[PDB]
Design a protein around this ligand. Structure first.
Ligand SMILES: CCCCCCCCCCCCCCCCCC(=O)OC[C@H](COP(=O)([O-])OCC[N+](C)(C)C)OC(=O)CCCCCCCCCCCCCCCCC
Ligand SMILES: CCCCCCCCCCCCCCCCCC(=O)OC[C@H](COP(=O)([O-])OCC[N+](C)(C)C)OC(=O)CCCCCCCCCCCCCCCCC
Ligand SMILES: CCCCCCCCCCCCCCCCCC(=O)OC[C@H](COP(=O)([O-])OCC[N+](C)(C)C)OC(=O)CCCCCCCCCCCCCCCCC
Ligand SMILES: CCCCCCCCCCCCCCCCCC(=O)OC[C@H](COP(=O)(O)OCCN)OC(=O)CCCCCCCCCCCCCCCCC
Ligand SMILES: CCCCCCCCCCCCCCCCCC(=O)OC[C@H](COP(=O)(O)OCCN)OC(=O)CCCCCCCCCCCCCCCCC
Lengths: 344, 111, 96, 71, 69, 318, 96, 172, 80, 112
C-alpha cells in the first residue's frame, strides 16, 4: 500500500505536466483525462458511505466536463483542420470551450458541486490537492487567451464572486467555508483574463499559498467552527495569533499581502477605462469578508473551553513548510513590484 | 478558367485488356525511356497537367509502335504467353515461368 | 503557462502530427495540401495580430478548398438552370 | 503511360461537362462561362461533382462506390 | 466397425457440394476464367478501365493483340 | 445467379449438421463396444429424417413467466452468426473476398455469446438465470487466450487475408514451426464452444441441463442445430490456418477433395475426446487459464515478433 | 454534406435530464458510454474523407480511454448499489 | 441499393439513439446500442476506412458492451419491462422522432428552404471521393501502424492503462 | 541459489518455461550479426516511385541508362 | 453490392424458421393448461439476484486486458518500415506493460 500512494500521488502532476507542456489538442485531452482517472482513489481511503456518494457526484460532473471539450476540439478540426493550440477559428468552438470548461474550475454556475464534494469527503488531510485542478485548466486559458466572446467570461465571473460570496454567510462547517470563497477567488482571476493576462497568475500564486496555509493549520484535529473555540485554551495560543494573522489577510487589508492582488489588478482594469466594472467587484468582496470576521470572533473570545479536556501530550503531526508560509503570506507586500515583471 | 478545345483528343489509345497489358510491360519500359521519364518531369516539376499535354502524345506514341512492332515479328509465342497469365486471379507471374522463355526465346535474341 | 521545453532541448513530443502537410510516411499528399504551403508562407514573420487583417485571402479560399462550401452551391444552382425546364426544351445532353 | 491516358480523360471530361453546359442556357442573371470558384489560379484536381454532373444514374454508382464492395 | 463407414459418406459429400458449387459458378459466370479480385484501388483501376475497352460492357472479355492491329 | 450460389451453401450444410448427430453415436458407439442406430435405417443413415420431424410436431410450450419479446430475437441469432460466419471462408474460392477478413471471424466469434446472455436471462430463475450468467464468464476469458495466439502466426505470414494463408503453407504445413502454439489453438475452441472436457455450459453433471432447459421441441432444434454449426466451422478453419492444402489452379476440385479428408478427420476429435475425459469444477476451469495457459501466450508473442526480424525473414506483406 | 447533420442530432444524446436521471442510474451512465460514437464517428469522417493519413490513429485513441475510463466509473456504481441493491438516483444524503 | 444507401443508414442511426436516450428499462438499453453501434460501424465501412471500422465490433461493441450487460444482473432491476408500453416513457419519444422528421420533411422538400439548411446539396455524393490513386495497404488508414513516428503518443496510453488496474484493484 | 532454481522446478515448471523464453528473446537481438542485414533489406524495397534528379555538372554518379554503372550494390542479396 | 444480398438472405431463413416452429403448433387445438406448473424443478424461487463479486471482477478484469490487444493489433502491418529499431524497442514495451499488469493483481485473484 504505502509505495503506490506515492506512485498515484506522483502521476497526478504528471497528468497536469502534459497539460502545460504540449502543442497538440489531443494531448490536452489525454492530459486532464487521466486526472479524473487518477484522482478517484485518494477520496476513498477510509471507505465510508459519503466519499463513495461523493466521488460519484464528482465523477460524472468531471466526466461530461471533459467529454464536451472533445466535442469542441473536433469542431475546428473541420474548419481549418489544423490542431495545435491557438484561437479556435470558429465561435461554436470557444463558446463550447469556455463555458463547458468552467465545470472543472467551477465558476458562477456549474457549482452545486464544489460544496457537495469538499464537504464530507471523509479525508480532510487533503483536499489540498484540489488546488491542482485550479492549475490544470488555467494553463489552457492562458494559451487560448485571444479568443473569447468577451461578454461571457465576465458574465460567469461577475455572477460568481457574488454567488460564492453569499453562499457561505449561512455556513458553519469550515470545510464548506473554504469551499465557498474558493469560487470567489475564481472571480478575480478570470475577470481580468482578456486584459493583460499576467497579473492573473499573480492572483493565482498568492492564492495557492494562502489557501494552502489554511489547511495545514486546520490540520491538527480541527473540523467544525465550534471545535475551533476549544482551541486556544487547549492546544496552544500561538496557534490563535496565526489563524487571526491570515483569515484577516485573506479577504485582505492593505498592510498585509492579501491586498496585493487587488491593488495591482485595478491598475490594470482601469487604464482600460472600465471603471464601472471593478467597483462592483471591489465592493462585493467586502461582504466576502464577513465570513472571516465572525469566524475570527470564535477563537479570540475565549468561548466556553470545551469541557474538562486535558491534553498534556505534545504534537507529532507534519507541519511541513507551515513554519514558513505566514511569513510569505503576510509580509510580502512591502517587498514586490516584481510579480508583474517577474513571472511574465 | 481556360480549357483546350475538343481537339488533340480522340487520339489513338492503346486498346488492350489488362491481362495483355501486363504481359510484356516489362521489356517495354526499361528499353524505351525516350519520352516517359522526361514526361514525368513535365508533370512533377511543373504541375497543372493542362499546360503539359504535348509529350502525352509522345509517350502514348511510343507504345503504339511498340505493340505495332511486336505484331510483325513474333505474335505467336506472345499470344500463347499472355493466355496463361490471363488464366486468372491476381495475375501471378510465377505460374507462367515455364513459358517465359518461349516468348523471350528470340525477342531478346532476334530483334 | 506554455513552457515549450521541446524547443530548448532536442526531443519531439508531437510537432509532427500537427498540421496537414508534414511527412505522410510514403509521401502521399492530402487534397488541400497545396494550399497549406501557400497559407503558412503568408503569416510566419507576422505576429498574428495583424495577420487577421492582413492575409485573409490565402486563408478564405483555403477554407473553401476544405469544405467545398461554395462550389457546391453554384453546383446545386445548375439543378435550377436545367431540371426546371426539362419539358420546355433542350433535354441536354444527347446521349451518349 | 497509364497516367498519360487519364489526364486526357478528365480534360475531355470537363469540356463536355462545360461545352454541354454553356449551351444549356445563357441567362442574363446567369454565370459567366467557366469562371473559378476560387481567387487563385492553377490546376486543382476536381471534385466528383465536377466530372459527373447531376447525371447520377448508374455508371456513377459504379465509379464512386465501384472499388468498395467488390471486384 | 464398418457400419460407421456409411455414416461418414453423408456428411462428407454434403461438404463437397459447397466447394464445387462456387468454384463452378465463377468459372461458369465468367466463362472459363477464375474471378478477378480487387484488393487494392490500383488493381481495381484496370478492370473499370477494361470494362470500357472490352467489347461492350464486361470485364471478362480480353481484346488481344490484333484488336489494335 | 449469385443468389443461387448462396442458397446452395446454406442448404447443403444443414445436412452435415443433421447427419453429424448420427455419426455422433456410431463412433461414440464403438468406443463403448456396441453398434449405433441400426434398426431404422437399414444402416441408420435414415435416422435423421425421422428425428427432424418429431420435434416440430411436438408442442412448443412457453413459460407463463417469460418475456416473449426476448424469447425470439435471441434464437433468431443462434442461427445467423452461425450461418454468416461461413461466408468468407476459402475452399478454395470463398464466396466473399474480404481484404482483412481474418479479423472478421473474431467479430463474429465475439458476438455470439451475447445471444447466450439473452436467452438464459430472457426466461426465468436460477437454473437458467445464474446458470446462464456464469457460462458467460468462462466464454469471454478464453478469447484472450485466442486473439493472441491467432495474432502470433500472422507475424509469420504477413497479412490479414486468407488468400495469402494458402500461399505461405505451401510446402511447410504451418504446424511444424509453432507446434507449441497449435496445442493451445485446439484447447481453446474446445473450451470456448462448450464441448466435452470443459463441458459446464450445457449441463449434465454440474446442473440439470444448461441453457437448453426451457426450450421444448419447437425452438430447441435451432440451438441443437446452432451449437453444431459452430463446431464444424472452427474445425473447418483450423485446417485453413494450420494444415494447409496445396492449391491447384487447374483441378480446383482436387483441392476440396483432399480438404474435406482433413477437416473431417480433425473434427472427429471432439467426438474421440468426449468418450474419454471428465469435468473441471468451474474454479479449476478459469483458474487454469490466467495462471497457466496465458503467461506462455504472451511469452511466445515476444518470440515470434523477433524471429523474423532476427533472420532478415520479414514476410512480404503490408 | 448531409451526413454531418446526421450524425450530429445524435450527439445531442446528452440530454441531461436523461444524463443524470431519472432513476436506474444505469440508464444515465449508459447514454454516457454511448455519448461516444457521436464523438468517434463524427471524427472518423472528417479525418477520413480528406486524407490526413496521420491523425488516423486518433480515432483509436478516442476509444482506448472512452472504454478505460467509463469502465472505471462503472465501479462506483457497484459501491452505491452494493450497500443498497437499488441505484435509484434519488439517494441525496450528502447535502447542500 | 441506390446512391442513398448511406443517408438511409444514418437516419436509422440517429433513430438508433433516441430509443435509449430517453428511459428504457436498461435491459433494452443494450438493444438501443448494438443497433446503433452496428449501423455506426456500418457507415464507417464506406469511405474506404475499413480496419478502423471492423475494430469497433471487436474492442467495444463485442467486447465492452458485454460488461455493461454482464452487470445489470448485479445491479439487477426489479421485474423488467417492455419500454414504450408505459405512459412515462412513451410521452417523451415522438416529439424527438418528429423533430428530425419535420426537419427532414421541409429541410429540403422543395427547391430550397431556406438558407442554413439549403447549403447542403444531396445525391451524387459530391465530395465522397476524389480522382483515382495508387495503393498503400490501401491508401488511407491502411497505414494506421506507427511504432515509428508515434511514440510519446503510445507511451502515455501505454502507461496510463497500467495504472487502470491499480486503482481498481483497490476500491474493489 | 541453484538449490532454489531446482526446487521451483519440482513444483511449478510452467511459468519457468515462460521466463526461460521471456529473456533469451530480449538478449539475442543484440548478438547475432544476421541482424542489421534485416535493416538493409527492409530499407531498399521501392514502395514509391524513384524520381530522377536534375543533373548540371555533378551528377556524382548514376547515368541516364540505369544498367550502366550508377550506384550501390544491392545484388549481395541475389547471391544470398 | 452483393454483400447485403448475402446477409438478409441468411436471417430471412432464420427469422422465418422461428414462426414455422414456434408459432405453427402454438395455435394448435391441444389442451395447454394455464396452471402455474411451469418453471421446472425450482418451483417458486422468490428473490432478487444478489450481488456476488467474484462473478463481477471477471468482467472488469478482462475488459482492460482487452484494450491494448487492440493497441497491439497493428504489428504485422508495422513490420514493414524505415527505421525498425523504434519498433522492436517499442513493440516489446506494450507486452511487458501488459504482463506487468498481471503480476500485480496476481497476488489476489481470489476464486476466479
Ligand atoms: C506600514 C505598512 C505598509 C507598508 C508600506 C511600505 C512602507 C515601507 C516603505 C519604505 C520606503 C520604501 O520605499 O521602501 C523601499 C526602501 C528603500 O530604502 P530607503 O533608502 O528609502 O530607506 C528608508 C527606510 N525607512 C523608511 C524604513 C527608514 O526599502 C525598504 O523597504 C526599507 C526596509 C524597511 C521597510 C519596512 C519597515 C518596517 C516598518 C513597518 C512595520 C510594520 C508594518 C506592517 C507589517 C505587518
Ligand atoms: C505548491 C505546489 C502544490 C502544493 C499544495 C499542497 C501540497 C500538499 C501535498 C501533501 C499534503 C498532505 O497531504 O499532507 C498531509 C499529511 C497528513 O496526512 P494524515 O494525517 O491524514 O496521515 C498521514 C499518513 N501517513 C503517515 C502515511 C503520511 O501530512 C501533514 O500532516 C502535514 C501537511 C502538509 C503540509 C503542507 C505542505 C506545504 C504547506 C505549504 C505549501 C507552500 C507552497 C509554496 C508556495 C509558493
Ligand atoms: C528477477 C530476476 C529476473 C531475471 C533472472 C535471470 C534469469 C536467470 C534464471 C533465473 C532463475 C530463477 C530466478 C528466481 C526464480 C523465482 C523463484 C520464485 O520462487 O519466485 C516465484 C514466486 C514464488 O511465489 P509463491 O511462493 O507464491 O508460489 C506460487 C508460484 N506459482 C505462481 C507457480 C503458484 O512467485 C512470484 O512472485 C512470481 C510472480 C511473478 C510472475 C511474473 C511472470 C513472468 C513474467 C515475465 C517476466
Ligand atoms: C520575552 C518573551 C515574552 C515573555 C515570556 C514569554 C512567555 C510565553 O511563553 O508566552 C508566549 C506569548 C504568546 O501569547 P499568548 O499565547 O496569548 O500567552 C500565553 C502563552 N504563555 O508571547 C509570545 O512569545 C508569542 C510569540 C510572538 C512572537 C515573538 C514575540 C515574543 C517577544 C519576545 C521576543 C521579541 C523579539 C522581537 C524583537 C523586535 C521585533 C519587533
Ligand atoms: C530455449 C527455448 C525454450 C525452451 C523451453 C523448454 C520447454 C518449455 C515449454 C514448456 C511449456 C509446455 C506447455 C506449458 C506447460 C503445460 C501447462 C502447465 O503448466 O500445466 C501445469 C498444470 C498445473 O498442475 P499443478 O501445478 O500440478 O497443480 C495441480 C495439483 N493438484 O499441471 C498439469 O499437468 C496440467 C495439464 C494440462 C491440463 C489439461 C490437460 C487436459 C488434456 C489435454 C491434453 C491434450 C493436449 C496435447 C497436445 C496436442 C497437440 C496437437
Amino acid at each position: 500500500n504505502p509505495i503506490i500512494f506515492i506512485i498515484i500521488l506522483l502521476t497526478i502532476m504528471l497528468g497536469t505536466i502534459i497539460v502545460m507542456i504540449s502543442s497538440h489538442w489531443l494531448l490536452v485531452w489525454i492530459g486532464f483525462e487521466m486526472n479524473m482517472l487518477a484522482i478517484i482513489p485518494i477520496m476513498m481511503k477510509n471507505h465510508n458511505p459519503r466519499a463513495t456518494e461523493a466521488s460519484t457526484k464528482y465523477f460524472l460532473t468531471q466526466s461530461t466536463a471533459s467529454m464536451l471539450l472533445m466535442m469542441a476540439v473536433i469542431i475546428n478540426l473541420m474548419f481549418s483542420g489544423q490542431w495545435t493550440v491557438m484561437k479556435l477559428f470558429n465561435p461554436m468552438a470557444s463558446m463550447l470551450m469556455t463555458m463547458a470548461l468552467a465545470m472543472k474550475l467551477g465558476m458562477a454556475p456549474f457549482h452545486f458541486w464544489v460544496p457537495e464534494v469538499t464537504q464530507g469527503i471523509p479525508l480532510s488531510s487533503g483536499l489540498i490537492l484540489l488546488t491542482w485542478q485550479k492549475l490544470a485548466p488555467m494553463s489552457v486559458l492562458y494559451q487560448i487567451f485571444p479568443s473569447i466572446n468577451l461578454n461571457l467570461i465576465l458574465t460567469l465571473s461577475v455572477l460568481s464572486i457574488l454567488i460564492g460570496g453569499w453562499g457561505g454567510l449561512n455556513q458553519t462547517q469550515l470545510r464548506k467555508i473554504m469551499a465557498y470563497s474558493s469560487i470567489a477567488h475564481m472571480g478575480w482571476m478570470t475577470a481580468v483574463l482578456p486584459y493583460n493576462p499576467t497579473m492573473t497568475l499573480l492572483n493565482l500564486i498568492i492564492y495557492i499559498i494562502m489557501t494552502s496555509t489554511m489547511f495545514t493549520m486546520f490540520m491538527a484535529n480541527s473540523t467544525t467552527t465550534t471545535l475551533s473555540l476549544s482551541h486556544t485554551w487547549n492546544k496552544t495560543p500561538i496557534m490563535t495569533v496565526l489563524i487571526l494573522a491570515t483569515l484577516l489577510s485573506m479577504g485582505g487589508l492593505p498592510p498585509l499581502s492579501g491586498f496585493m492582488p487587488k491593488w495591482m489588478i485595478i491598475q490594470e482594469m482601469t487604464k482600460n477605462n472600465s471603471i464601472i466594472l471593478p467597483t462592483f467587484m471591489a465592493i462585493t468582496a467586502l461582504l466576502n469578508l464577513y465570513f472571516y470576521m465572525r469566524l475570527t470572533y470564535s477563537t479570540t473570545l475565549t468561548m466556553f473551553p470545551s469541557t474538562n479536556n486535558m491534553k498534556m501530550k505534545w504534537q507529532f503531526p507534519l507541519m511541513k513548510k507551515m513554519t514558513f508560509l505566514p511569513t510569505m503570506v503576510v509580509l510580502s507586500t512591502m517587498m514586490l513590484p516584481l510579480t508583474p515583471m517577474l513571472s511574465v | 478558367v481556360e480549357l483546350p478545345s475538343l481537339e488533340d483528343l480522340k487520339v489513338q489509345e492503346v486498346k488492350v485488356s489488362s491481362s495483355v497489358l501486363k504481359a510484356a510491360a516489362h521489356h517495354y519500359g526499361a528499353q524505351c525511356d525516350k519520352p516517359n521519364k522526361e514526361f514525368m518531369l513535365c508533370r512533377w516539376e511543373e504541375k497543372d497537367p493542362r499546360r503539359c499535354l504535348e509529350e502525352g502524345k509522345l509517350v502514348n506514341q511510343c507504345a503504339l509502335e511498340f505493340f505495332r512492332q511486336i505484331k510483325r515479328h513474333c505474335a505467336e509465342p506472345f499470344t500463347e504467353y499472355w493466355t496463361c497469365i490471363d488464366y486468372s486471379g491476381l495475375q501471378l507471374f510465377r505460374r507462367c515461368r515455364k513459358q517465359q522463355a518461349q516468348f523471350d526465346e528470340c525477342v531478346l535474341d532476334k530483334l | 503557462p506554455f513552457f515549450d521545453v521541446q524547443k530548448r532541448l532536442g526531443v519531439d513530443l508531437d510537432r509532427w502530427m500537427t498540421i496537414q502537410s508534414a511527412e505522410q510516411p510514403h509521401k502521399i499528399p492530402s487534397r488541400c495540401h497545396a494550399f497549406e504551403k501557400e497559407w503558412i508562407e503568408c503569416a510566419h514573420g507576422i505576429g498574428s495580430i495583424r495577420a487577421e487583417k492582413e492575409c485573409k485571402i490565402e486563408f478564405e479560399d483555403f477554407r473553401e478548398c476544405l469544405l467545398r462550401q461554395k462550389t457546391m452551391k453554384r453546383l446545386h444552382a445548375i439543378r435550377r438552370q436545367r431540371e426546371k425546364l426539362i419539358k420546355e426544351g433542350k433535354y441536354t445532353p444527347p446521349p451518349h | 503511360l497509364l497516367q498519360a491516358e487519364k489526364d486526357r480523360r478528365v480534360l475531355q471530361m470537363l469540356r463536355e461537362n462545360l461545352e454541354e453546359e454553356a449551351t444549356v442556357m445563357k441567362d442574363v442573371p446567369g454565370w459567366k462561362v467557366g469562371e473559378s470558384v476560387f481567387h487563385t489560379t492553377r490546376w486543382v484536381t476536381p471534385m466528383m461533382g465536377e466530372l459527373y454532373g447531376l447525371r447520377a444514374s448508374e455508371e456513377v454508382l459504379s465509379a464512386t462506390y465501384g472499388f468498395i464492395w467488390y471486384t | 466397425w464398418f457400419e460407421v463407414l456409411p455414416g461418414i459418406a453423408v456428411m462428407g459429400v454434403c461438404l463437397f457440394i459447397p466447394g464445387m458449387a462456387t468454384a463452378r459458378i465463377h468459372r461458369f459466370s465468367n466463362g472459363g476464367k477464375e474471378k478477378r479480385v480487387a484488393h487494392y484501388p490500383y488493381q481495381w483501376y484496370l478492370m473499370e478501365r477494361d470494362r470500357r475497352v472490352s467489347g461492350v460492357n464486361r470485364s471478362y472479355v480480353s481484346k488481344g493483340l490484333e484488336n489494335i492491329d | 445467379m449469385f443468389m443461387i450460389n448462396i442458397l446452395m451453401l446454406i442448404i447443403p450444410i444443414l445436412l452435415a449438421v443433421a447427419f453429424l448427430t448420427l455419426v455422433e453415436r456410431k463412433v461414440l458407439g464403438y468406443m463403448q463396444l456396441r453398434k449405433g442406430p441400426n434398426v431404422v435405417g437399414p444402416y441408420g443413415l435414415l435416422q435423421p429424417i425421422a428425428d427432424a420431424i418429431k420435434l416440430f410436431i411436438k408442442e412448443p410450450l412457453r413459460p407463463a413467466t417469460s418475456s416473449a419479446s426476448m424469447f425470439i430475437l435471441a434464437p433468431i441469432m443462434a442461427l445467423g452468426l452461425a450461418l454468416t460466419m461461413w461466408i468468407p471462408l476459402p475452399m478454395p474460392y470463398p464466396l466473399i473476398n474480404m481484404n482483412l477478413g481474418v479479423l472478421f471471424m473474431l467479430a463474429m466469434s465475439s458476438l455470439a455469446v451475447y445471444s447466450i446472455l439473452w436467452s438464459g436471462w430472457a426466461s426465468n430463475s436460477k437454473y437458467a438465470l445464474i446458470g446462464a450468467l456464469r457460462a458467460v464468464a468462462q466464454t469471454i476469458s478464453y478469447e484472450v487466450t485466442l486473439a493472441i495466439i491467432l495474432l502470433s502466426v500472422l507475424l509469420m505470414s504477413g497479412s490479414f487475408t486468407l488468400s495469402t494463408l494458402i500461399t505461405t503453407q505451401e510446402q511447410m504445413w504451418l504446424i511444424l514451426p509453432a507446434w507449441p502454439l497449435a496445442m493451445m489453438w485446439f484447447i481453446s475452441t474446445l473450451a470456448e464452444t462448450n464441448r466435452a472436457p470443459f463441458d459446464l455450459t450445457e449441463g449434465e453433471s454440474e446442473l440439470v441441463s444448461g441453457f437448453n432447459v426451457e426450450y421444448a421441441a419447437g425452438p430447441f432444434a435451432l440451438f441443437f442445430m446452432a451449437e453444431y454449426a459452430n463446431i464444424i466451422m472452427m474445425n473447418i478453419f483450423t485446417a485453413i490456418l494450420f494444415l494447409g492444402t496445396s492449391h491447384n489452379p487447374h483441378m480446383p476440385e482436387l483441392y476440396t477433395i483432399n480438404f474435406t479428408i482433413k477437416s473431417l478427420l480433425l473434427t472427429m476429435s471432439f467426438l474421440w475426446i468426449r468418450a474419454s475425459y471428465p469435468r473441471f469444477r468451474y474454479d479449476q476451469l478459469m483458474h487454469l487459464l490466467w495462471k497457466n495457459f496465458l503467461p506462455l501466450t504472451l511469452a511466445l508473442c515476444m518470440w515470434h515478433v523477433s524471429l523474423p526480424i532476427l533472420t532478415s525473414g520479414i514476410p512480404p506483406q503490408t | 454534406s448531409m451526413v454531418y447533420m446526421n450524425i450530429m442530432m445524435a450527439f445531442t444524446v446528452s440530454l441531461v435530464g436523461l444524463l443524470m436521471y431519472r432513476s436506474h442510474l444505469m440508464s444515465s451512465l449508459l447514454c454516457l458510454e454511448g455519448m461516444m460514437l457521436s464523438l468517434f464517428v463524427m471524427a472518423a469522417l472528417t479525418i477520413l474523407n480528406s486524407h490526413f493519413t496521420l491523425a488516423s490513429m486518433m480515432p483509436i485513441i478516442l476509444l482506448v480511454f472512452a472504454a478505460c475510463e467509463a469502465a472505471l466509473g462503472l465501479s462506483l456504481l457497484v459501491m452505491v448499489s452494493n450497500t443498497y441493491g437499488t441505484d435509484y438516483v434519488q439517494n441525496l444524503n450528502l447535502l447542500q | 441499393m441506390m446512391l442513398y444507401i448511406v443517408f438511409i443508414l444514418s437516419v436509422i442511426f440517429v433513430m438508433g439513439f433516441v430509443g435509449f436516450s430517453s428511459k428504457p428499462s436498461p435491459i433494452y438499453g443494450g438493444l438501443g446500442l448494438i443497433v446503433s453501434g452496428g449501423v455506426g460501424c456500418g457507415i464507417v465501412l464506406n469511405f474506404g476506412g475499413s480496419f478502423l471500422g471492423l475494430m469497433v465490433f471487436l474492442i467495444y461493441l463485442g467486447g465492452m458492451m458485454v460488461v455493461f450487460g454482464y452487470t445489470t444482473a448485479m445491479a439487477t432491476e426489479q421485474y423488467p419491462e417492455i419500454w414504450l408500453s408505459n405512459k412515462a416513457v412513451l410521452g417523451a419519444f415522438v416529439t424527438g422522432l418528429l423533430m428530425e422528421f419535420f426537419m427532414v420533411y421541409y429541410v429540403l422538400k422543395d427547391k430550397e428552404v431556406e438558407v442554413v439548411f439549403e447549403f447542403n446539396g444531396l445525391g451524387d455524393w459530391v465530395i465522397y471521393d476524389t480522382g483515382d490513386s495508387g495503393f498503400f495497404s490501401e491508401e488511407a488508414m491502411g497505414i494506421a501502424a506507427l511504432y515509428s513516428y508515434g511514440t510519446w503518443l503510445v507511451i502515455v496510453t501505454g502507461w496510463s492503462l497500467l495504472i487502470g488496474v491499480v486503482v481498481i484493484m483497490e476500491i474493489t | 541459489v541453484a538449490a532454489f532454481l531446482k526446487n521451483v522446478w519440482a513444483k511449478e515448471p510452467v511459468l519457468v518455461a515462460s521466463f526461460a523464453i521471456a529473456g533469451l528473446a530480449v538478449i539475442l537481438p543484440t548478438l547475432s550479426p544476421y541482424t542489421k542485414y534485416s535493416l538493409m533489406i527492409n530499407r531498399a524495397t521501392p514502395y514509391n516511385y524513384p524520381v530522377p534528379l536534375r543533373d548540371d555538372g555533378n551528377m556524382p554518379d548514376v547515368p541516364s541508362h540505369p544498367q550502366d554503372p550508377q550506384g550501390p550494390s544491392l545484388e549481395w542479396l541475389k547471391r544470398l | 453490392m452483393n454483400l447485403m444480398l448475402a446477409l438478409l438472405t441468411n436471417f430471412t431463413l432464420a427469422t422465418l424458421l422461428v414462426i414455422i416452429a414456434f408459432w405453427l403448433p402454438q395455435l394448435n387445438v391441444y389442451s395447454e393448461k394455464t396452471s402455474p406448473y411451469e418453471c421446472g424443478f425450482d418451483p417458486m424461487g422468490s428473490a432478487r439476484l444478489p450481488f456476488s463479486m467474484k462473478f463481477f471482477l471477471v468482467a472488469i478484469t478482462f475488459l482492460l486486458f482487452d484494450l491494448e490487444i487492440a493497441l497491439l493489433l497493428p504489428l504485422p502491418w508495422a513490420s514493414q518500415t524505415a527505421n525498425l529499431n523504434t519498433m522492436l524497442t517499442m513493440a516489446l514495451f506494450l507486452i511487458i506493460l501488459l504482463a506487468v499488469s498481471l503480476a500485480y493483481e496476481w497476488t489476489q485473484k481470489g476464486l476466479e
